Every structure is written in structure tokens, then in C-alpha cells.
Design an enzyme around this catalytic site. Structure first.
Site, PDB file in Angstrom:
ATOM      1  CG  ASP A  93      12.857  16.974  21.825  1.00  0.00           C
ATOM      2  OD1 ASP A  93      12.571  18.195  21.642  1.00  0.00           O
ATOM      3  OD2 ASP A  93      12.487  16.314  22.813  1.00  0.00           O
TER       4      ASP A  93
ATOM      5  CD  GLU B   3      15.734  20.770  22.731  1.00  0.00           C
ATOM      6  OE1 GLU B   3      15.232  19.686  22.934  1.00  0.00           O
ATOM      7  OE2 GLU B   3      15.215  21.845  23.057  1.00  0.00           O
TER       8      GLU B   3
ATOM      9  CG  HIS C  40      10.005  25.051  18.567  1.00  0.00           C
ATOM     10  ND1 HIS C  40      11.337  24.763  18.331  1.00  0.00           N
ATOM     11  CD2 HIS C  40       9.548  24.107  19.420  1.00  0.00           C
ATOM     12  CE1 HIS C  40      11.652  23.669  19.024  1.00  0.00           C
ATOM     13  NE2 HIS C  40      10.575  23.267  19.681  1.00  0.00           N
ATOM     14  CG  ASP C  41      11.573  25.211  22.562  1.00  0.00           C
ATOM     15  OD1 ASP C  41      10.363  24.964  22.541  1.00  0.00           O
ATOM     16  OD2 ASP C  41      12.395  24.280  22.352  1.00  0.00           O
TER      17      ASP C  41
ATOM     18  CG  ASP D  62      12.145  17.964  16.363  1.00  0.00           C
ATOM     19  OD1 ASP D  62      12.734  17.367  17.321  1.00  0.00           O
ATOM     20  OD2 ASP D  62      11.989  19.246  16.345  1.00  0.00           O
TER      21      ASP D  62
END
Ligand SMILES: [Mg+2]
Length: 559
Positions: free
Chosen positions: A197, A253, A329-330, A95
């Protein structure tokens, strides 16, 4: 390209497996569970961030790009994990969190000291307005202002996320070079690519204009917070300076992305990224622009989901590339958010899986998705996420734009922590995640929902996902076929067709609790089908008319 054919498993490592008993999942834990992920069939792992961080946003606030957070292990453990992933014929994506750093990053600790510091312009510093207030009315994604005052130097710094996540200054070439150096360090050590990210945030409107306002809120999150004027310039430079030098995969993302932004990111001729995550399909169950944001909940609307996924399927059908995800994870567990997570949990998990995996793009399986993990019944005081703590204070306590009862209800549907309770390995203490005390409790339902029982049950969601992945590897139409939405107006059934070199793949899924009817359109009535997968007992295979049971899903291939 291997990334087009890949199935990615996302690990949230603080919650995956705790090998050393301190209740915090670690990198040796991941190593010890690689065989499980390979047996499921995923060939790429995306690891949420393990770099040193004070954990204000659980790793997404990085204080050292070149070392691990001590609870994860050391760099030696990370190098071993890379090797172990490779020895199994898999790839590892890390990430990349370079819109912002921790405020405990040495760069920021320096930057804030003085205007003459060499790191001052690594970040985004602006004068107060004449009355001392913030440079403008921009808000943080985690509530309040996007600006925090530094008494020492008399300026505000920008943070789109927490106040402990100051935004880097991509206008400064030294910042861009630092990023590139970080990328090379890890890629030279065998990292196969990056999940980038908040990649939509890295370019700012450097005039820092105020938003227009309706007076519904003091601080505004809107169109300036993504898709800045230099965004694609910066990503094209990152490709030239870094990505073009390695056999790698990239997934951005892409906050703020719509279908045209996705083409800019993903068109191979633009030499940017391979694929992005959008939020548009995740956005279908909030109001468009309430002061309450994502917490202003709407029921699941299948027609909205059909419209959005279709728009994305067709827009990147012959240019660019899609990601396919319902969990990360969100996001909450999709079956609890939008489906049935009780008597029909298995059917519903399999149904959502079938809709997603039958489309064009690279599928992402979030840890525990494959076993049907569900949202948690824990009380609000047990949640950990700063997003929830900050939104409670702003929305419920201060501004009073949501009641306590309405907020609790919204958290129980969409809180990020539903994704973050530990992975459920077996039915023993802490679901076998730890021999110690876990950093957050395991979901109360773990004794019924866990790897151990799934592997004992031939009807498990696990074996279903395993089968979907095998089929993708067997039937190239799943990867390369085009896409056409069928029976578009049906409020229960999501059906579509893929076509590739004379073959057809028909996906029919009842995303509802009640009976439904699929009738094939006239042009498909004289096709012969072989059923590749279904979540109910019987065949198959006269797909021209299917009386659908609750959450029934079938995929057929033409013969
Ligand atoms: Mg540990």
C-alpha cells in the site's frame, strides 16, 4: 514465474461474504466462496487488509500487524484461509500497509507520550513554526493539513492520510526491522506475497520543504509526497532482507509513478518488486491539478486512455512488468464511470475486459467486476468513506471550490463506495451477502446483477471473464507477446497487436455506443484469423475489415 502468468482476484473482505450474520464480511465467508473464485479461474487472491484496525480507513489504519480485526475472525481463521487457498492450488497475497499505522497502534500510543519514549522516533514529529502553525504547507490526501498537533509534547506529527494514520519513520532502522519482522511472520505462515500500500510514500524529503504555491489552496499535495530520495534504497533493502528469501509475488501501489519510476520498481535486475499499480490511466478523467483533485471530473476520453495504456505497454515491453486493472476498492465500476451500464451493460463490460486482458501484464479482477457490478444510486448521506466526508467539508462547505450539486455529481461517478457495496451473490434479501443487516446497503440493482443469474446465463459477463482467463492459460502469446497500437487516431476503436514467435493476436474493441469501422493496416491484410472470443452473436473471422456494433469486441489469433 507464476506471477507473470497469474490472474489475480481482489477481495474486499468486509464486503465479500458474511458467514456469521453480523453484516460484516468475514474470513470464513471468504473460505466458503473460494470454489467460486477457482471456477472463475483466478489463481491468486489479493485480500484487502484484515489486520486489527479501528476502521478509520476500513483496515488501511492498522493497530496490530500480527492479529486480525475481530469482525474478520482470529489468526486461526486466517491460517485456515491460507491452507484452503493452497489446497485449491491457488496463492494468497496480503495487503502490506507500512507507510503508516493507526494512531491506536501501540507504537503510536507510546510515541506520542513523551520525547523520551522509545517509540518517539517510530513516527515523524516536527516543531511548529514560530506562530504555532504547521511545519510546512503539505496536505493530506484526505483533505486538510498533513500535520496534526500534539498538545502533550508540543510537536506536530505527519500523516499523508487521515489524522488516525500517522506515517512511520523509515529513516529509523528499528522501524524497517519491525516491518521486516511483520513480513516474515506472515510469509513463514504461508502468505505468498504482498500488495504494498502507498509504497511510493515511504521515503520522505526530511528537510520537509514547503511547496511553491499559486494561492489556489492552503494545503498542497505534490511531488514531495512520493518518490523520496531513499525510496528505492529502502525497497532494495526489503528485497535483500525479506523478499529474496521466499517464493513470492509483490505488487506495489505506486502512488506518483510514471513509466520511468515503474522501471525502477520493476526491472528484475534492480531486485525491488515484480510489478506495480500506477494511477496514470485512472487519472485521465480529472483535471491535472485542480484544488478539487479527483473530484474535478472530465468526460472519458478514449484517446487519452489509448495514449496512457500504450505508453505503459511500450515502456515495460522488454523490461519490468505491468499490472492490468480498471477496478479496485478505490475506483468506481468502470462501466458506469466510462461506459454504458444499462441496455449495453453486458457488451460494455465485456469490451473493457477484452481491452485490458489482451495486453501484456498480470490482470486484476476486482470482486464483482466479473458480473458487471455497477455504481450505486444511493444518496450522499448513505456513503461511508471518510474521503467523501472530508472532501465535502473542505471543498463544498469551507473553501467553496465546488458547489454541492457538482460535488454530488462527482461522487456519483467516482466515490470509492461504488466498489464497496456488498458482492451480489443472488437475487434474495441483501443479494445473499448476509442474513443480517449489511454494513452498507447492497446496490439497488442487485436483483438483476448477481452470481446466480450470471451462472444461469451462457451469455453472462461471468462466462466471458472465465473464457478470457482460459485463453490466457492456453495461448502463451497473451502473456509473452509484445504490443503495438493500431489505428491510433480512431476516436472510438481501441485496437492493438501482440506478436510472439511468428504468431499474432489482434484485439479490436469499439469503446463507444455508436457504429465504428476497423480496417487492418496494410501489413496485416493477408493474415488468416481464428476468432478466440467476441461479445456479439455472429463470427468472425475476416478481421481485415470489421463493421463494429456498439461496444463490439473481438480477439483473433493468426493461423
Ligand atoms: Mg460477519
Amino acid at each position: 514465474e507464476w506471477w507473470k502468468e497469474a490472474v489475480v482476484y481482489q477481495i474486499y473482505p468486509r464486503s465479500f461474504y458474511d458467514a456469521n450474520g453480523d453484516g460484516f464480511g468475514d474470513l470464513q465467508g471468504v473460505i466458503q466462496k473460494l470454489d467460486y473464485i477457482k471456477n472463475l479461474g483466478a489463481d491468486v487472491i489479493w485480500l484487502s487488509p484484515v489486520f486489527d484496525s479501528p476502521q478509520d480507513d476500513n483496515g488501511y489504519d492498522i493497530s496490530d500487524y500480527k492479529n486480525m480485526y475481530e469482525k474478520f475472525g482470529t489468526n486461526e481463521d486466517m491460517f485456515q484461509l491460507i491452507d484452503e487457498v493452497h489446497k485449491r492450488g491457488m496463492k494468497i497475497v496480503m495487503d502490506l500497509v507500512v507507510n503508516h499505522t493507526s494512531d491506536e497502534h501501540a507504537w503510536f500510543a507510546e510515541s506520542r507520550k513523551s520525547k523520551d519514549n522509545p517509540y518517539r522516533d517510530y513516527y515523524l514529529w516536527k516543531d511548529p513554526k514560530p506562530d504555532g502553525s504547521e511545519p510546512n504547507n503539505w496536505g493530506s490526501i484526505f483533505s486538510g493539513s498533513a500535520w496534526t498537533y500534539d498538545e502533550g509534547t508540543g510537536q506536530y506529527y505527519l500523516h499523508y492520510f487521515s489524522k488516525k494514520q500517522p506515517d512511520l519513520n523509515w529513516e529509523n532502522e528499528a522501524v524497517r526491522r519491525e516491518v521486516y519482522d511483520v513480513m516474515r511472520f506472515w510469509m513463514d505462515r504461508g502468505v505468498d506475497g504482498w500488495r504494498m500500500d502507498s509504497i511510493g510514500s515511504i521515503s520522505k524529503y526530511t528537510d520537509f520543504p514547503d511547496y511553491e504555491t499559486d494561492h489556489s489552496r492552503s494545503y498542497i499535495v505534490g511531488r514531495y509526497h512520493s518518490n523520496g530520495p531513499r525510496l528505492h534504497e529502502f525497497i532494495q533493502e526489503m528485497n535483500r532482507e525479506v523478499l529474496s528469501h521466499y517464493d513470492c509475488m509483490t505488487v506495489g501501489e505506486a502512488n506518483g509513478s510514471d513509466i520511468e519510476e515503474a522501471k525502477k520498481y520493476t526491472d528484475a535486475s534492480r531486485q525491488e518488486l515484480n510489478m506495480i499499480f500506477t494511477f496514470e490511466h485512472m487519472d485521465i478523467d480529472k483535471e491535472q491539478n485542480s484544488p478539487n483533485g479527483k473530484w474535478q471530473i472530465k468526460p472519458f476520453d478514449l484517446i487519452a486512455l489509448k495514449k496512457t495504456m500504450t505508453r505503459w505497454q511500450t515502456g515495460l515491453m522488454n523490461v519490468g512488468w505491468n499490472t492490468l486493472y480498471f477496478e479496485n476498492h478505490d475506483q468506481p465500476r468502470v462501466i458506469s464511470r466510462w461506459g454504458n451500464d444499462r441496455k449495453l451493460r453486458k457488451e460494455c463490460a465485456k469490451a473493457f475486459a477484452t481491452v485490458l486482458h489482451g495486453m501484456k501484464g498480470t490482470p486484476f479482477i476486482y470482486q464483482g467486476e466479473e458480473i458487471g457490478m455497477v455504481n450505486s444510486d444511493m444518496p450522499l448521506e448513505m456513503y461511508d468513506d471518510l474521503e467523501i466526508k472530508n472532501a465535502y467539508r473542505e471543498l463544498v462547505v469551507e473553501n467553496k471550490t465546488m458547489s454541492e450539486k457538482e460535488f454530488v455529481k462527482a461522487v456519483m461517478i467516482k466515490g470509492r463506495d461504488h466498489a464497496r457495496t456488498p458482492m451480489q451473490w443472488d437475487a434474495g434479501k441483501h443479494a445473499g451477502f448476509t442474513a443480517g443487516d449489511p454494513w452498507i446497503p447492497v446496490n439497488s440493482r442487485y436483483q438483476d446483477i448477481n452470481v446466480k443469474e450470471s451462472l444461469e446465463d451462457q451469455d453472462s459477463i461471468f462466462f466471458y471473464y472465465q473464457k478470457l482467463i482460459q485463453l490466457r492459460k492456453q495461448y502463451k502469446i497473451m502473456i509473452y507477446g509484445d504490443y503495438q497500437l493500431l489505428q491510433e487516431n480512431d476516436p472510438q476503436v481501441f485496437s492493438y497487436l501482440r506478436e510472439y514467435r511468428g504468431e499474432k493476436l489482434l484485439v479490436v474493441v469499439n469503446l463507444s455506443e455508436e457504429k465504428a469501422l476497423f480496417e487492418a493496416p496494410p501489413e496485416l491484410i493477408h493474415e488468416r484469423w481464428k476468432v478466440l472470443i467476441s461479445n456479439y452473436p455472429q463470427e468472425r473471422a475476416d478481421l481485415k475489415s470489421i463493421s463494429l456494433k456498439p461496444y463490439e469486441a473481438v480477439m483473433g489469433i493468426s493461423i
